[PDB]
Amino acid sequence: MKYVIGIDGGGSKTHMKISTLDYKVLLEVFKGPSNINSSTKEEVKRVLQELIMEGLGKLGQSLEECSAICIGTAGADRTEDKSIIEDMIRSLGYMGKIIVVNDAEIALAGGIEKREGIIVISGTGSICYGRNKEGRSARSGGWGHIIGDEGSGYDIGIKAIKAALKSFDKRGEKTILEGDILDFLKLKSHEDLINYIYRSGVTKKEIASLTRVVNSAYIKGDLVSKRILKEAARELFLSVKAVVEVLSMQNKKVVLTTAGGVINNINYLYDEFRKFLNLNYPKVKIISMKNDSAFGAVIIARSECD
Ligand SMILES: CC(=O)N[C@@H]1[C@@H](O)[C@H](O)[C@@H](CO)O[C@H]1O
């Protein structure tokens, strides 16, 4: 009867779980992206409306019976973005508790099931977020696909295209990415990449998918692809170092986990990142996420209920 909503506005999808107050997940719903930095406000509003309404339709209950809603989404970086997202949910007619956080905060909650720890995201975007034993939080990275997202899938896809073009026009080292990217995208020639990137409405998720090609080429022995993966791991490590030092956790026991289909999928990248952490922070323990981010959002919403 009573339920909560938890929404993960990740870089790959929007993922909503509806749960009872004793954490029995009743249903989940998937829609497209919800980042106001890469879609119009009307586009995002529509996504969240369609997402919530499809779940309520399966649930058979109205929104005003919902005890709390938590949404962690990419693009919720500033207090001003928090209130914009809150407004698109209130516009549905909800007057209960709404908690809007960055997608890294719900990944922390789902991954560690506590408030204290470190989370690195590398999916279509990248970010590090942490909270120390004193309850103080900090973040690094997360500045988006133009002025940030170092070590994200989007960043690896752009760098893969750049390395393939430099291989083609003779400014860089030869790499099998030169032909492999064209095969993957079903393009005849490198000039076709101009239509693909600038003319066709390409999405961040589409560019980030080229991380699959880099991983494949690394397995085939390609040195350029291997160095792209290594440098992304270093960028991700730098974001942890930044948060660890800001929160004065350099020499404290810390639990760290990771989210996103780039850091969690590519063995070499994950290994290099773990190596950097192990070199620098003896007391950081690395674990896998206990639940997913949408269940983290359920934890944050339900924890606000009596
Ligand atoms: C769009 C922006 O400025 N920053 C987002 C950030 O909110 C998010 O935490 C991160 C990982 O999903 O992706 C970045 O692109």
Structural description of this entry:
It catalyses: N-acetyl-D-glucosamine + ATP = N-acetyl-D-glucosamine 6-phosphate + ADP + H(+); N-acetyl-D-muramate + ATP = N-acetyl-D-muramate 6-phosphate + ADP + H(+). Substrate binds at residues 35, 142-144, 149. The protein has helices at residues 41-59, 79-90, 103-112, 144-147, 153-169, 177-185, 192-199, 204-208, 211-219, 223-246, 267-280, 293-303; strands spanning 3-9, 14-20, 25-31, 66-73, 97-102, 117-122, 126-131, 137-141, 254-259, 284-286. It has 306 residues and is an alpha/beta fold. It has 3 domains: 3-113 and 292-303, ATPase, nucleotide binding domain (Nucleotidyltransferase, domain 5); 117-146 and 230-286, ATPase, nucleotide binding domain (Nucleotidyltransferase, domain 5); 154-225, no CATH class. α3 crosses α12 (293-303), α5 (153-169) crosses α6 and α9 (211-219) packs across α10. 2-acetamido-2-deoxy-beta-D-glucopyranose (NAG) binds next to α3, β7 and α4.
**Any idea what the CATH architecture of the largest domain is?**
2-Layer Sandwich
CATH C-level name of the largest domain: Alpha Beta
Order of helices and strands: EEEHEHEHEEEHHHHHHHEHEH
What is the CATH superfamily label of the largest domain? Answer: ATPase, nucleotide binding domain
Distance between the termini: 15 Å
Count of beta strands: 10
Let me know the largest β-sheet.
Answer: 5 strands, mixed
| Number of helices, where a helix is a run of at least 4 consecutive DSSP H or I residues | 12
CATH-assigned fold name of the largest domain: Nucleotidyltransferase, domain 5
Strand order of the largest sheet: 3-2-1-4-5
Structural class, by secondary structure, is: alpha/beta
Q: What's the structural domain tally?
A: 3
The radius of gyration computed from the alpha-carbon positions, rounded to a whole number of angstroms, is 20 Å
Strand content of the residues, in percent? Answer: 15-25%
Helix content: 40-55%
